[PDB]
Symmetry: C3
Subunit: 187 residues, 3 copies
Amino acid sequence: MKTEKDKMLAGEMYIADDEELVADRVEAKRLTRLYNEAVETGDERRFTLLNQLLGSSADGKAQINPDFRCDYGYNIHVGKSFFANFNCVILDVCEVRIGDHCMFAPGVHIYTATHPLHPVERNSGKEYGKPVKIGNNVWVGGGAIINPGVSIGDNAVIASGAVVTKDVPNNVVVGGNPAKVIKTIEE
Amino acid sequence: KTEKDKMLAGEMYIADDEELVADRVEAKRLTRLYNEAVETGDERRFTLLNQLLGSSADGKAQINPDFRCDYGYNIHVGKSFFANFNCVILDVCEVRIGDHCMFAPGVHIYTATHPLHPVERNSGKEYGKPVKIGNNVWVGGGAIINPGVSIGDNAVIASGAVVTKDVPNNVVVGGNPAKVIKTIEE
Amino acid sequence: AMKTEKDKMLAGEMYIADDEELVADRVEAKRLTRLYNEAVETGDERRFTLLNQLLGSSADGKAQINPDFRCDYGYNIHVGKSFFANFNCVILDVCEVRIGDHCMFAPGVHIYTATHPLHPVERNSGKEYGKPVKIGNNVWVGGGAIINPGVSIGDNAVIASGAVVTKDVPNNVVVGGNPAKVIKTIEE
Ligand SMILES: CC(=O)SCCNC(=O)CCNC(=O)[C@H](O)C(C)(C)COP(=O)(O)OP(=O)(O)OC[C@H]1OC(n2cnc3c(N)ncnc32)[C@H](O)[C@@H]1OP(=O)(O)O
Ligand SMILES: CC(=O)SCCNC(=O)CCNC(=O)[C@H](O)C(C)(C)COP(=O)(O)OP(=O)(O)OC[C@H]1O[C@@H](n2cnc3c(N)ncnc32)[C@H](O)[C@@H]1OP(=O)(O)O
Ligand SMILES: CC(=O)SCCNC(=O)CCNC(=O)[C@H](O)C(C)(C)COP(=O)(O)OP(=O)(O)OC[C@H]1O[C@@H](n2cnc3c(N)ncnc32)[C@H](O)[C@@H]1OP(=O)(O)O
């Protein structure tokens, strides 16, 4: 009684080649291409296009540099004054919730998509995701990776190249691969 | 024997050889067309890919934009190949990938490399080492797979992993440099 | 003096990112980068003449940079002779990026001179800053390596693929890992 798209958003195994999901993706790719051309050439319509790609932004003025990639787009919800530098990728099979005043340096990747560890489940045509939640005033450094299901508290700083495999508390700098706490921000 | 011959054989070759240069230029030119085909959703994406890749077991490899490669023709994939956004494959030597393999976004595979010593490195000659990836390998996002590496069946490469040496069957590797994190029981 | 935000930025002082001159500079860099990338991708002979308008300087006007290259300003990037960068390198040149001769970047290398305050309020103040990056001669940066702001890399250094370079790197070493550590030295 659930559609594949229902299952996907729900964290449950779903069929990636479901006809609706497929059409959502070819649409996202098409719009993303227009968006990228718009931001690359500095056209004011980039916001109009972004605002049809992203599931939502708090101020309809998110700044995202080229070439952005996403799976669906509509699962991405960002707060006020969102900035993302060159070449960010967001696999938003599940919800990606980002707070206010967040900044991504170039090449930041956020994944909610994943697979089973075992070859048969994984090769079975089904797969699933775990939503990612990012707080307020989070600064993600260049090339960091935020794995599925991860949550990052407010005022956190992800160092460049960090592979964030576990939740990150408020007011910490984390770094490394896998990332660990390396400092506490004092207020 | 041609510079292309030495290249495939893992020997020092002259990167600026006339034939190799034209190969690389054709590859870039066709890659742009392919990437546009995928981005716009045109079903001629497959025909293009099949002209670019060395071979595909089912002619139905699913590779998202923007794919980049050196030659293309040294890449051979099994069936149901999938690579997500922004994968890069430097196929100066053979890159052989099994069946049901999945690359997440931003996976890089390098067969190309250079001499550690300045003079040799700058001498206009380079070399490669082939990469072999078995069946049912899942490579996580932003993993790097170095020249010469082999990855055995059912291995999963964690996201961000820098895979500097061989990966046996049925393990999960992670980290930088990568190391075994757990074995898999299937 | 008659000192602008751009002047503070170059000097490594806090600057207002959205200063109209700087904003317009970044917009120009993007338009030109898009042409450049198209020129190199399609194999056109004018790629060099375009690249020479983008970069601050090159020693020989013949730098080889594969698509899709990206940079903040372009004009803070100064390369020596025989520069090579493979696919998808990003350079944030808010401050100077000086690169010596015979350097080669593998795909996906990122050089950052841009950074931010660690505290949220200062970071959200519309102000930011940078620390310049200096890379010597005969440097090979392996694929996906990251050069952080303020880093110096000595002559003949080899950065392993995936290395995250957070501190100065001396002459004639191979470094690797996260954070990058010396693995071995290299002498000719
Ligand atoms: C094809 C497509 O486009 S979709 C795929 C796109 N998305 C991805 O790439 C997701 C990447 N997934 C990962 O990296 C996961 O960490 C996987 C593959 C290793 C799966 O691991 P999981 O067991 O489900 O998560 P979990 O965090 O619990 O793993 C356990 C441990 O390994 C860890 N671990 C996870 N990632 C790493 C890592 N990169 N390096 C070292 N250890 C790691 C944890 O540190 C953890 O430690 P512990 O059990 O000793 O306390
Ligand atoms: C939004 C935009 O477009 S601009 C942003 C683009 N550029 C970036 O991404 C820059 C990334 N910045 C960083 O990673 C920095 O190193 C930060 C955020 C950790 C700032 O920390 P700092 O205090 O200025 O450097 P500091 O050397 O003191 O940090 C301490 C240690 O952590 C380290 N450390 C710093 N950066 C990292 C890192 N990227 N990865 C792992 N460890 C790191 C250091 O190795 C250092 O070692 P030590 O205490 O053992 O001597
Ligand atoms: C410009 C272009 O387009 S071409 C380049 C495209 N592709 C590249 O980036 C290739 C990258 N090559 C590498 O990173 C190699 O690992 C290099 C440069 C470090 C050279 O390493 P080599 O000495 O030839 O191979 P080797 O695997 O024997 O290196 C030895 C050690 O360093 C290691 N080592 C290799 N890579 C790393 C790494 N990323 N981090 C830490 N240690 C590493 C090994 O663990 C090894 O340890 P040990 O001998 O103490 O047990």
